[PDB]
Subunit: 363 residues, 5 copies
């Protein structure tokens, strides 16, 4: 995504002021086309009122501009954007926590599957390759950034995520439904086959591996759930009527009428509404928070970088069960072997952050 966490660590003077100058993933990149439509529809109405209309027709238009200005109220639109965006953002973070990480299975496979030989090394690599394949097959079904990377099953085989003997089995299992559950069943049968040859010692270690598989299966079941059960379409169509009804009234009610007749509220002619345009960046920009996060697996600048994460999870999983299985650093006494009060040193810029120990608020 767009990470600006380093910029906003402290509350300086230009903390949020400098974030308005950024372009990538900003409000300006989203509202670029909607602004020029709103400018062009605004000044077309103003040039008709200032050049084209006759005197009897300008009086007819000024009664229309005072009628539209009454319904152009800001308060009830801010309600329905507030409860809708709070629904989208709560669904947004819940889909990030549903993205499966191999690291809980990675710890147990790398220690409880014995064997330093060729067959035991091959057994640990195949277990973790199924756990990655059970995650690639659910991300390519829900993320357009992954589906363009893997458009077919042949692209999965060419990437090494599925050997060609597995694809021959994967096609013979004739099922019309989605097949993301299949590598998470091959994980269960290979782990039990590992137990029956003595690669796992006890049943408690086998059940501990199978419990972390079903955690990863429930993670993939949530991503299938948020993708299939969208936000209700009637509740998306409400909040986009109310935003477009507000901006329809502001095309007519926020014109600059002729001050020589001196209507109440239009005493000054300024040729460009500064504060009406700033409400367009406010209200339409707070709708673009909903348009960008309603599917966080697309190709926006703030959607999830899932193509990166597949490349991370493949490299890390095949490194911890292959190059780190029973390969430990040599045990040695640390620096605090005889010191019961360890005091790690401070640098110069951090030495004012030495706080006394918090004993409790009652002291």
């Amino acid at each position: 995504t767009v990470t600006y966490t380093n910029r906003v660590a402290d509350a300086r003077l230009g903390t949020f002021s400098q974030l308005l100058l950024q372009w990538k993933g900003s409000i300006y990149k989203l509202l670029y086309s909607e602004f020029l439509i709103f400018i062009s529809l605004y000044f077309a109405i103003s040039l008709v009122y200032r050049l084209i209309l006759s005197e009897s027709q300008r009086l007819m238009f000024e009664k229309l501009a005072l009628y539209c200005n009454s319904y152009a109220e800001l308060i009830p639109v801010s309600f329905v954007l507030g409860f809708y965006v709070s629904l989208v953002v709560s669904r947004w973070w819940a889909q990030y926590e549903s993205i499966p990480w191999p690291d809980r299975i990675m710890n147990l496979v790398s220690c409880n599957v014995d064997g330093e030989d060729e067959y035991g090394r091959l057994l640990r690599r195949t277990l973790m390759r199924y756990s990655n394949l059970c995650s690639v097959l659910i991300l390519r079904s829900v993320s357009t950034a992954v589906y363009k990377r893997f458009p077919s099953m042949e692209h999965v085989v060419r990437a090494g995520l599925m050997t060609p003997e597995e694809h021959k089995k994967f096609e013979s299992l004739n099922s019309p439904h989605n097949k993301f559950w299949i590598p998470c069943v091959w994980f269960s049968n290979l782990a039990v086959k590992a137990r029956n040859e003595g690669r796992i010692r006890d049943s408690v270690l086998l059940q501990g591996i199978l419990n972390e598989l079903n955690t990863l299966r429930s993670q993939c079941g949530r991503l299938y759930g948020y993708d299939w059960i969208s936000i209700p379409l009637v509740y998306t169509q409400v909040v986009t009527v109310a935003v477009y009804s507000f901006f329809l009234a502001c095309l007519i009610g926020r014109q600059f009428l002729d001050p020589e007749k001196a209507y109440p509220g239009h005493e000054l002619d300024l040729f460009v509404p500064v504060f009406t345009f700033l409400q367009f960046f406010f209200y339409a920009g707070w709708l673009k928070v909903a348009e960008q996060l309603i599917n966080p697996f697309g190709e926006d600048d703030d959607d999830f970088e899932t193509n990166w994460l597949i490349d991370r999870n493949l490299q890390v999983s095949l490194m911890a069960v292959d190059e780190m299985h029973q390969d430990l650093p040599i045990l040695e006494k640390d620096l605090y072997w005889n010191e019961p009060d360890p005091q790690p040193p401070y640098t110069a810029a951090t030495a004012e952050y030495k706080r006394p120990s918090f004993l409790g608020s009652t002291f």
Copy 2:
């Protein structure tokens, strides 16, 4: 339901604008009958004011139209729709997560119940058939889309979800209460009977199966809970008084009075209120979000497709414990057997999504 997740992946120009043109499951299909009642009651009042009423009676009506326009305020109605719909939508997603999925039991039954013979294959099919039957009997009690598919117990037997010898036992258990708990007790006794014949090796594998049964029993207990304990009727009757009190005031307060008397606020006669009708699509359409989601197991276009999901869960469960029990693809070295840095390839349209690795915000 109605899935539009593919349309709203990116934040383009016509992202939410194109969703207003869709018909199925939209605001127009719900508000079709309420709109024509509101049009017919509106213009009946206008034709009486413009044709039927005398001059002394029009003056009596104009004082009524200015009285009703004061109570036709929009702000406090938007409060009580906001907190009510946020209750319905939070209950809406919590009932989707209560729909039981067999896949956690499906992994453990397909690996820990040994036997490739006829009796062991028959034992795994009967365990998963009880877990599906314990879900069909709770969905036909809470979903009108399932009850019309299975109106009696005889339809369950004809669908193969219950053998006729089981229905003879299911009727002899004389109980006045709902009997969805019975197949989840038959699962427990058959799994212990499987252990005593040596089909399950250790007690830890038996307890791991029985823990995933009680998870599925707690899933069925929530669907029984949301169906029995509705949203409070006094709290549904409040939010439908406040919407109908608003539209009652807008039938009289939003008339176009005679501009020749020039009341403040009614200076223009336009013969059709454009912005009053757009508030009808806003407020009554944001009540139809509550009317459609208050029971998401009915037959609306956005209620849950549970008839599909029974057909999925029956086909997948009897495929993973029958055709996939100890039927593995042949183990083979993958492409990254000697490469400690796996780099899966990118397509042409995805090659700009190569990001450097996120090391942390402090770097």
Copy 3:
């Protein structure tokens, strides 16, 4: 409670319109006495203004009616009802999920406590009778609907929930505090006594039973917590001042003044305020949502039917560990023994609900 889930399954025309006509548990049964107080205090003021007051006193009253009409504003009252009712309803559903269900213990006791003889059958009935007694003793402490059914310990013994030999032990345990924890300790010692005679095979099955006891103990600890720690009284007294301050201003500010003096806002005399009474059904009815749900174990029409649920949990628990212990239907091949694509049939009214399988949004 009042279940109307069958009525609101679909979004028809008269979906929420027909719910206003229902009486039981409605807004009309709650606001019956408060409405007649508000009518009688309203028209008493109006008859004094129209018959009793002199001309100099009516002028003094009209300045009071314009003063009270300024403070009779609707917006800030709707805030504090919104956040207060959202607190009550979140506490309301959290107390339903704290009501203990025996069904998770019922599965494990009915399969892991061996013995088809007289002593083993008596052992399973006593385990489940303690789990029901540990729930009756916490419901009679928190629910007035249960305490009127069981006013003393003698009513518990006459209902068969406690044998007279257990009450002799239950009184000798001299403790001033509440004794709902005692049957959940007798469950632990009887389950360990069952293990030492060989009725439970392994320690893993014993710990699986004891884990589901402590789940039920934590359920009873929440019901003790919500009953002892109420909503703060200062926060209940705020929201009932603001509702009564609003209705105090509407008794004077919403009078119909004399239109012959033509005050701004009171141009019409109508003898009965229609929209002021509809705000009484709105605001006072949205306070009755809080008055009814602040203790959902009382005797309102929408409080929890806990007297029913004790009769269910006693009949079901003593049926699954007695008549269903190792009493299985005969294993038999189902209809889909040779069909790898099960297609359960559809009825006539459900045949349009055949959907193609959802493969994912990217397809």
Copy 4:
């Protein structure tokens, strides 16, 4: 706290009306001193305007009173009280659920630690005494009601929560940080020492005890977390500026100006503002909800009664592992030994609460 759950069980007429008459823990006991400051500052301004000021100075004051009345608006203050109190109340209930209860450890220690002799009885009393001591040492650090009961370690020894041989060990462990974690480490080593002498049979029962210890350790870690990480001080200082800015404007803007000049809005002189004082009970009373719950372990009338709960948890824990270890009532056939349909009897006042069994909404 103040428990009024018995009063508000039903929705009668005077349900919330009678709660305004209560004194203890009410809005009147909190706002007693702030009201007399607000009365004395109000009528001091009024007596200066009515007696002290000259004619040219009263005209200068009336322009100030109309200026302050414009900023005395109620709507934006109600926002920031609503989101702040909803933060406090969500943190309030989360600290009650963090208060550790011994009852989950109490079940497992009372059954799995064998021995009816003197040493086995002494072993169970010492395990539960560490679990109470690990809770007293965290409550005296976070609760001022407990710290005044136990000001030093010597008061803990005199209360019998720590034997003098344990305090000699508790002081030799030289650590500057808070030492609430020490009795939860002594519990782990004594439970393993119990296993190695044969007092606990299997490792599964030992791990089941140690899992319920770490649950209680995570409960004490939350109370340390809510006490150390307060609500942000900048977010407390915002909501108390906005309340005091509102009441500063109401000291001048809500004066009764002279009606002989007849300003718009001040047409009547009434000598005491009734509705301005009722907004003081509303807004300042809804700030006292935040002032009382921001530390629920203090000595307010609605803070948590934790001194009571230590006396409960000490008496109950040493009663269930001492007088109830393997002391069971005699097993006997209950009343429903031969009746498969148990029907417990109803009293006279409860016989109308016989409901038919809820089969599901689709029936």
Copy 5:
């Protein structure tokens, strides 16, 4: 952070009034520079209007000041600050609960890893040193207060958190991604190596240690998640446009116009706006709640004191597995050996807090 929990324990008179006088971490330290910009831009406009502008130009400016005063409305800005700060604060507390604590692993390592000799003591110190190193490597990636303490890997070795033989292994593991997962894999292999030499007795104790490792791995995975997936930048840029659009209108609309022309609303010249400046402390100060909590690991006065917590977790973990392994106080009969009703004594200031036991609300 800034802990004021001792001050606000009771609801006294000056409870929240005294918090405005505090400087550290307050609203005044954050708004110090933004206030002087707002003062200097305000009085520059006022001195131009009072000294520089001509008579025809002052009339042109007064029409601009009445135009800007209409858009300077407070209500819709308070919506979008309310939903944005409620998002930040919910993410704020969720990152505190993601900070890993060693104390759950600390209990199990200190009891289940046998051996009082030199090798067994060295084995327990190395297990807990990996669990601290797996937390330092994730905090130095997300916290600028920790990264300035440990700028490189060489500072980790000099602090004794990593022996130089481990850094030689830590560099040979060639991976471009972040390496916080590596010490949580070394923990798994050393714990299994401990089992194979007989330092851990059974597999159930080994799986209990490995389950508490993966809990700590999921804690570190959340801190990596909140740091990488920020609040959406478009949703931060909306709420800072709306605050700055409000203050732009208040620089012109809140001027004091000339009262000799007597515009409606500007009847009095007061030379300094008191209530406009108090809205600056309100609105801009309620934006500084968001600016300070959006990254709670920085160096603000209310960000998390994580440098302290590393020094605590290092001292406590190496004290409980070294000086407290099987070092128990001597078992002895407590004071309540023969008293079945323990009554711990009360002090003088706490003796009025003797409450009778809460039996339940129905009594």
